[PDB]
Every structure is written in structure tokens, then in C-alpha cells.
Design a protein around this ligand. Structure first.
Ligand SMILES: OC[C@H]1O[C@H](O[C@H]2[C@H](O)[C@@H](O)[C@@H](O)O[C@@H]2CO)[C@H](O)[C@@H](O)[C@@H]1O
Length: 322
């Protein structure tokens, strides 16, 4: 049994959808952000929610599930692709980078909803060819469609990226998913053995290094007095196994298993100063500044869409009670 219900979320139109296990709220105008995700059995909110509309607009990448197309930093907002030079807005001033892409602060359209025994589906879409300021930076006819499915104890979250134009383009996508994470009573695990060395502008030097505490990270560790803003390489490419982050809440015994497919090659993990009570385990299909690295695409995760092609990158959030 499942429902869809149109609502107002802090003065903006939104769609609440759910079954008897999970409820989401997606906010199409706010970069199609999944702003709320509630575990129905225990009635716990899983995502960091904004106090007011105003605070959300202040930091739209730090609540719910913001969409990063493309994810993280591009040095000087410049790169070339197949002979051609691109200049993206340098919105991160102190580090002279473009940061977080085109989509987390634009209006997406609701394209359909569907309800059956197989679950409840909400689909949103945005066509970058309709955003003139985006076209000035990135003159290509990219269309991104999100497919959200709640089925049983899992929110599935699929991005389909389409090239509807006449020239090829590089792309990557990531999510700035922000979970409630009380430092005292939560544990975190991640399928990674290595991470990217970063310079003072948070750009990769191109070198990998071992994660010294990787056994701890594998099994589940606390993050008390650890400040993270780290680009981890998923262990999947090299060892197989899983590709996922796990948050465990110790009081309510809730596991949150955030899986991503083989295209999701990197995880940025961010917790600010470690005192803010949240955690962002961010899966990305390409590494920070991927466009500018002369490294194999199997390592960076850089991908290209030829005219007429499309790709679907899949991930999911499963709630288990134990
Ligand atoms: O723009 C500076 C910005 O960066 C830091 O936090 C970033 C983080 O570096 C990124 O990797 C990303 O995942 O999320 C954050 C931006 O939402 C600083 O901690 C932050 O104060 C600063 O605004």
C-alpha cells in the first residue's frame, strides 16, 4: 500500500510519497532535492532538514539529497574536452574553483508518478538547454531525469543522463546526501581502501594513498574528533565486493545502507567540524576535477555521451531495523 500527496514544504510546492515503511518529500523547485526521508516504523527523520526556507537557500547543498551535476570542484572553472575550452562560473572564490555544478538551485519539472504493487515512483526532469546562463558555460543539450522509487524498506534513486544535442559532452554526477549523525551514538562504514591526495585547494594531485584506518572504516567506526573532507576511492574497482556507505544509529538500532552501482567510483565524506550533528557520504561517478586529470577513465570515472546516447547511474538507501 502506497500514497502520493501534493503538499507545501516551507512555502514551496512538494510531493510527499511513501509506503508503510518509508516516506520521502521531494521539492522539484529546490533542485529536485529529496528534503525528507522518514523511517515509518520508529518515526525517525533520516535527513538533515532546513529550519526555514531562508536557511535552505543559504546552503542548498547541506540538506536532504542535493544533486551535483557535475560533482565537487573544477579548478579555475576551466577544462578542455576534445580540443574545446570551457569556462564555468568560479563560485568558490578563496580557492578559485567552480563548485557543485548546475542543478542544485534550479527548478525541475515533475514528469510523472506511478503506483503499483511494485512501489511508488516519482520522476523529475530538467533540460539544461532551457537554462540560458547554464548554456553560456556549457553549450550542450544535456537532459537529466531522476527516478525515485520507494519499494519495501528502500528508496531507489536513479539518474538518467541524455545527450539530445549534436556534439558529445563529458559528464559526472554525485549527491550531497546529508544524514543526521549524532557523533556520540552513530557509527560509519565505507567500502574504500585508498583515497585521493588533495592540495590546499581541495583538488587531487593525482596520487592515491592507503587509508591507514581502513579496517576500522570497513567494519564501522565512530567519527568523534575526526574532521573529514576526503575523497575516497571505492574498493569495488580493485577487489569487487560491495560499494556502499553504512550509517548505524546506536539508540534506535537503525542501519542505513547507502548503495551505489559500479559507476560510482568515489565517495566524498564530509562532516564539517564534526560538531554539527550531520554526515554527508557523497557518491560520485567521477573524482573532483576529473575533467583536468590525464589519468585513465577507469580510475577517474570520467564519462562521455555521444549525440543521442543516454546512461543511468543507480543508487539506493535501505533502512533496516535490528
Ligand atoms: O566553498 C568552501 C566550502 O568548502 C568546505 O565544505 C565543502 C566541501 O569542501 C566539499 O567537499 C563539499 O562536499 O561540501 C562542502 C560545501 O557544501 C568548507 O567546509 C565550507 O565551510 C565551505 O563553505
Amino acid at each position: 500500500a502506497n500514497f502520493i500527496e501534493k503538499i507545501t514544504y516551507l512555502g514551496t510546492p512538494a510531493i510527499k510519497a511513501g509506503n508503510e515503511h518509508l516516506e520521502m518529500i521531494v521539492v522539484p523547485e529546490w533542485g529536485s532535492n529529496v528534503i525528507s526521508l522518514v523511517d515509518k516504523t520508529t518515526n525517525v527523520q533520516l535527513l538533515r532538514e532546513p529550519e526555514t526556507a531562508e536557511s535552505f537557500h543559504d546552503t542548498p547543498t547541506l540538506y536532504g539529497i542535493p544533486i551535483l551535476f557535475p560533482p565537487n570542484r573544477i579548478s579555475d572553472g576551466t577544462f578542455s574536452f576534445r580540443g574545446r575550452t570551457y569556462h564555468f562560473d568560479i563560485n568558490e572564490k578563496d580557492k578559485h574553483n567552480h563548485l557543485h555544478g548546475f542543478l542544485y538551485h534550479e527548478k525541475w519539472n515533475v514528469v510523472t508518478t506511478k503506483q503499483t504493487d511494485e512501489g511508488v515512483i516519482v520522476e523529475t526532469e530538467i533540460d539544461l538547454s532551457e537554462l540560458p546562463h547554464v548554456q553560456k558555460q556549457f553549450p550542450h543539450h544535456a537532459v537529466v531525469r531522476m527516478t525515485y522509487t520507494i519499494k519495501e524498506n528502500t528508496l531507489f534513486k536513479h539518474a538518467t543522463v541524455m545527450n539530445k544535442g549534436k556534439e558529445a559532452f563529458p559528464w559526472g554526477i554525485g549527491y550531497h546526501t546529508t544524514f543526521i549523525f549524532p557523533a556520540e551514538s552513530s557509527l560509519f562504514s565505507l567500502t574504500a581502501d585508498q583515497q585521493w591526495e588533495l592540495d590546499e585547494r581541495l583538488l587531487p594531485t593525482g596520487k592515491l594513498m592507503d587509508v591507514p584506518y581502513k579496517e576500522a572504516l570497513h567494519e564501522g567506526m565512530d567519527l568523534r574528533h575526526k574532521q573529514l573532507d576526503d575523497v575516497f576511492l571505492s574498493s569495488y574497482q580493485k577487489r569487487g565486493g560491495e560499494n556502499q556507505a553504512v550509517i548505524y544509529h546506536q539508540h534506535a538500532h537503525i542501519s542505513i545502507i547507502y548503495k551505489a552501482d559500479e559507476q560510482f567510483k568515489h565517495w566524498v565524506v564530509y562532516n564539517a567540524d564534526g560538531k554539527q550533528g550531520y554526515l554527508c557520504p557523497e557518491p560520485y561517478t567521477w573524482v573532483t576535477n576529473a575533467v583536468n586529470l590525464d589519468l585513465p577513465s577507469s580510475l577517474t570515472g570520467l564519462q562521455v555521451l555521444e549525440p543521442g546516447e543516454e546512461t543511468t547511474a543507480k543508487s539506493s538507501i535501505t533502512i533496516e531495523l535490528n
